[PDB]
Design an enzyme around this catalytic site. Structure first.
Site, PDB file in Angstrom:
ATOM      1  NE  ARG A 199      13.691  12.454   2.536  1.00  0.00           N
ATOM      2  CZ  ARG A 199      12.972  13.375   3.178  1.00  0.00           C
ATOM      3  NH1 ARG A 199      13.518  14.498   3.638  1.00  0.00           N
ATOM      4  NH2 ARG A 199      11.688  13.138   3.411  1.00  0.00           N
ATOM      5  CD  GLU A 215       9.486   7.311   9.684  1.00  0.00           C
ATOM      6  OE1 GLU A 215       9.160   6.445   8.846  1.00  0.00           O
ATOM      7  OE2 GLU A 215       9.012   8.465   9.692  1.00  0.00           O
ATOM      8  N   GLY A 257      -4.921   0.751   2.190  1.00  0.00           N
ATOM      9  CA  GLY A 257      -4.833  -0.545   2.825  1.00  0.00           C
ATOM     10  C   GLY A 257      -4.384  -0.545   4.266  1.00  0.00           C
ATOM     11  CG  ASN A 313      13.495  11.291   6.782  1.00  0.00           C
ATOM     12  OD1 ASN A 313      12.699  12.165   7.133  1.00  0.00           O
ATOM     13  ND2 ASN A 313      13.562  10.850   5.530  1.00  0.00           N
ATOM     14  N   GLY A 335       0.814  -1.203   0.000  1.00  0.00           N
ATOM     15  CA  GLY A 335       0.000   0.000   0.000  1.00  0.00           C
ATOM     16  C   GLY A 335       0.849   1.255   0.000  1.00  0.00           C
ATOM     17  N   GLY A 336       0.493   2.195  -0.869  1.00  0.00           N
ATOM     18  CA  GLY A 336       1.181   3.467  -0.963  1.00  0.00           C
ATOM     19  C   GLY A 336       0.170   4.580  -0.778  1.00  0.00           C
TER      20      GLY A 336
END
Lengths: 114, 526, 206, 44
Positions: free
Chosen positions: B226, B222, B105, B224, B100-101
């Site tokens: 960048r 999470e 979902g 990142n 899912g993007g």
């Protein structure tokens, strides 16, 4: 704390000052306003606790000088060289007396040495 | 990740991490698996049992020899395996489609009874995609750790940013020093962050994000891989030109050769001595406090005369303001002054009023907020910092007045110069204002009293004012009390009034029931 | 449903400002900016009672030579300042007399006297342009306190007169066309004119 | 006792001021957040 008067009492002062007339213009008046409003928010959380009255010439009005709009109150005064308005000590006194106000800040020049 | 691939194949440098680490760390699933592979600094429940063989002190990579049975376990083949997993993590859980993007979902599940229909729905939303289940976390703090790594294995941490203030999962307000966390816990989290980064070979700037709770339990969320928009926060507290350091990393310059860092570690500005960052972990200490605020010509970098050490910007879309202080209180005070002056600008006034209010809330004052704080602050349509009603109606009425008057005058003097002997009546001082506030209209009249004086007539009352007209579409009024400042934005059917730092908006409506002719003459027919 | 409290800044106490303020308001009355109702049409009449009292009131010359002599503390020859300040001082002593006249002509003679002896070669009408306000002040002030009650209203009279004489000669339209050609180049004076006789009845009663 | 504490105050860094010669625009400089300025109409 509840009020400037309370500040004076709590901290041992002796003169309740709620209104200051700036007997100047430009950066002196502006710097004074910015600094004072920051202190007023810090002490009482209300930047308008000390109202400021400014004198406004037609020239300054047409120029729409930001200090005019920044200021809390304005009084139209006669135009021309600073010697007829900024330097009329008696007129300044008359205005201070008329409102009345509790303090005067002159900054630098125009009447700084009389 | 294809970007570093293509530039590297063409010998063009990239101001960011290399391809392998960018792909192996950019894919959310794979990155979560690496986190699981490392020493799991309190990963969520759904990934407790998930792990991998040792990625050790040399170069590390994805290998899918073992993480495919386990991986498919994260990809819970059916409702039964989902319900058991849900029991292990403990309710409440989230059923999430792995392919899912853009939010498709994902369903929130509170109990095993609720689970089945949401499971069939997630399947229907992304059919054919494996589905996984993750723990709906508890109310926590969202924190960030700033990372910087070279091409030789030296990677360090600097400090963090507090990003608990979020709106619809978007970071809205940032603060640099997360004084709330325990120094020891922050040191451990930094070392874990460094371990994970070194383990995967990061070679640029990065931010490691963690979730912290008041209990003192924390969980990694999470990474990142960048640069973020709020990195200048670090530049202002570290006295480090961050993009120049990033460039130098791309030039193969060792960490120990950056002037800013040398000063940071109290060494010679021009020496070449390698630095043991572990032995010098304690040397750097934050300087004061910083508050960053997300705000929503065409791009005006916004900072004025009211305060030093505070600056900001707005682009056209969004911008950010940063306020430094010796301590939290000093920085908040400085921030306040910046928002009152900047608040006087227009399209972002009411929203920023609620923002100033939120900034003034006791919870904020006490640093008693969390990720859901804000989530409960909204649905609270708390309209306040709102002008005096009748002042509102006044400056309105005379804004419309002045504008119409300017039109009538400019039409008379244009036309009269241009040669029409017009009938007297239109020359009127006579102003009829009909202004609907909250179902009520205020009906007033205004008669022009002197080239500089206007007289407002309320329901058979008389108040006499003067204005001394301004240049660029503003009107200020002065009374016994004081002088106020107003600007007027007009719409088709709304009247958009600014009274200092305050905005108020009024509707004019009579359409759906009255048929108004827009012209004179005879009525021919129906 | 309004605060009448902050509606107080209408009067003052300085009669000098009462003069300038009320006067500018009234010349604005007769510029056309009149008010549509009885309230107003009453209030200005009262304003004129304040006038009448202050028009008999012999504190006008003192408050205006006060205020100018406050505004010329510099640029000053002390001979003339101590002369003027002594003899104003005993205008002040002789005020409220039945036999009080302005020391105006005396001042004209003294000022003309050291103008006679000519702070010369650089600054003749430098000095004149430093003592300007006084020569026009003394020029209103030759015929007395009702020198003013004559003069000011007489001017207002010709203001009314001039405007409404051009206004009526033929008929409204053609007369406005005669205005077009009397001042062909500009019409701002015309618009103020049109505005003035637009609120004639207020003007007329008043 | 300012005599006993004469040595306590120490300057924090260095500052450079420059006289420069809407109608009054306080001009903030983006080159440095620790640098700011103004111009009025005359000087700033």
């Amino acid at each position: 704390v509840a009020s400037p008067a309370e500040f004076v009492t709590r901290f041992g002062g002796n003169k309740v000052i709620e209104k200051v007339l700036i007997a100047n213009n430009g950066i002196a008046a502006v710097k004074c306003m910015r600094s004072i409003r920051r202190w007023s928010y810090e002490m009482f959380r209300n930047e308008r606790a000390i109202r400021f009255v400014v004198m406004v010439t037609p020239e300054d009005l047409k120029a729409n000088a930001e200090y005019i709009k920044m200021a809390d109150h304005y009084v139209p005064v006669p135009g021309g060289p600073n010697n007829n308005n900024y330097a009329n000590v008696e007129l300044i006194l008359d205005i201070a007396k008329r409102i009345p106000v509790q303090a005067v800040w002159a900054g630098w020049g125009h009447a700084s040495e009389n | 990740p294809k970007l570093p691939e293509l530039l590297l194949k063409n010998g063009i440098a990239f101001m960011g991490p290399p391809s392998q680490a960018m792909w192996a760390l950019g894919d959310k699933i794979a990155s979560s698996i690496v986190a699981q592979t490392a020493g799991i600094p309190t990963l969520p429940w759904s990934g407790s049992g998930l792990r991998v063989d040792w990625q050790e002190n040399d170069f590390s990579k994805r290998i899918l020899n073992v993480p495919q049975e386990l991986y498919e376990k994260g990809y819970v083949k059916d409702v039964d395996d989902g319900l058991q997993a849900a029991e292990e993590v403990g309710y409440p859980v989230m059923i999430k489609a792995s392919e899912g993007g853009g939010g498709k979902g994902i369903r929130k599940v509170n109990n095993a009874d609720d689970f089945p229909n949401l499971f069939r729905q997630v399947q229907a939303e992304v059919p054919g995609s494996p589905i996984f289940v993750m723990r709906l976390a508890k109310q926590s703090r969202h924190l960030e750790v700033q990372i910087l790594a070279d091409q030789y294995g030296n990677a360090i941490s600097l400090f963090g940013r507090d990003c608990s203030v979020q709106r619809r999962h978007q970071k809205i307000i940032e603060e640099a020093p997360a004084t709330i966390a325990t120094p020891a816990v922050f040191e451990h989290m930094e070392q874990c962050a460094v371990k994970l980064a070194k383990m995967v070979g990061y070679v640029s700037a990065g931010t490691v994000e963690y979730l912290y709770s008041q209990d003192g339990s924390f969980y990694f969320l999470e990474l990142n891989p960048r640069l973020q928009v709020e990195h200048p926060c670090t530049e202002m507290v570290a006295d480090v030109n961050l993009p120049a350091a990033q460039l130098q990393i791309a030039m193969g310059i060792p960490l120990y050769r950056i002037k800013d860092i040398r000063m940071m570690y109290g060494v010679s500005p021009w020496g070449d001595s390698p630095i043991d960052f572990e032995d010098s972990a304690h040397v750097p200490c934050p300087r004061g406090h910083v508050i960053a605020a997300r705000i929503t010509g065409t791009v005006q970098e916004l900072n004025f005369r009211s305060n030093k050490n505070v600056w900001g910007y707005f682009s056209v879309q969004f911008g950010h303001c940063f306020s430094w202080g010796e301590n939290r209180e000093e920085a908040i005070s400085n921030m306040v002054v910046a928002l009152k002056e900047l608040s006087i600008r227009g399209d972002f006034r009411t929203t920023v009023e609620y923002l100033i209010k939120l900034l003034e809330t006791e919870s904020f004052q006490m640093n008693r907020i969390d990720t859901g704080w804000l989530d409960r602050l909204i649905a609270e349509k708390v309209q306040a910092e709102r002008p005096d009603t009748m002042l509102g109606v006044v400056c309105g009425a005379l804004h419309v007045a002045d504008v119409s008057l300017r039109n009538s005058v400019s039409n008379f003097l244009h036309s009269l110069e241009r040669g029409q002997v017009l009938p007297a009546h239109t020359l009127l001082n006579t102003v009829d204002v009909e202004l609907i506030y909250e179902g009520v209209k205020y009906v007033l009249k205004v008669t022009r009293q002197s080239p500089n004086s206007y007289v407002v007539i309320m329901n058979g009352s008389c108040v006499e004012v003067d204005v001394h007209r301004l240049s660029d579409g503003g009107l200020l009024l002065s009374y016994d009390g004081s002088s106020y400042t107003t600007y007027m934005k007009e719409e088709v059917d709304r009247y958009r009034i600014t009274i200092g730092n305050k905005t108020c908006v009024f509707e004019k409506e009579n359409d759906p029931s009255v048929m108004r002719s827009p012209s004179a003459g005879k009525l021919i027919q129906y | 449903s309004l605060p009448r409290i902050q509606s107080t800044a209408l009067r003052g106490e300085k009669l000098h400002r009462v003069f300038h303020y009320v006067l500018d308001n009234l010349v604005n009355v007769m510029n056309g900016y009149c008010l549509p109702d009885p309230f107003f049409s009453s209030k200005v009449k009262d304003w004129v009672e304040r006038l009448m009292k202050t028009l008999r009131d012999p504190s006008l010359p003192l408050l205006e030579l006060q205020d100018i002599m406050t505004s010329v503390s510099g640029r000053i020859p002390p001979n003339v300042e101590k002369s003027i300040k002594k003899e104003m001082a005993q205008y002040a002593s002789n005020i409220t007399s039945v036999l009080c006249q302005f020391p105006s002509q005396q001042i004209a003679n003294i000022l003309d006297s050291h103008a006679a002896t000519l702070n010369r070669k650089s600054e003749r009408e430098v000095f004149f342009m430093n003592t300007q306000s006084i020569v026009q002040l003394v020029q209103r002030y030759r015929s007395g306190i009702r020198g003013h009650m004559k003069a000011v209203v007489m001017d207002l009279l010709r203001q009314y007169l001039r405007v409404e004489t051009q206004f009526q000669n033929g008929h409204y339209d053609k007369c406005v066309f005669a205005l077009r050609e009397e001042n062909k180049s500009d019409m701002n004076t015309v618009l103020n004119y049109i505005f003035s006789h637009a609120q004639v009845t207020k003007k007329n009663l008043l």
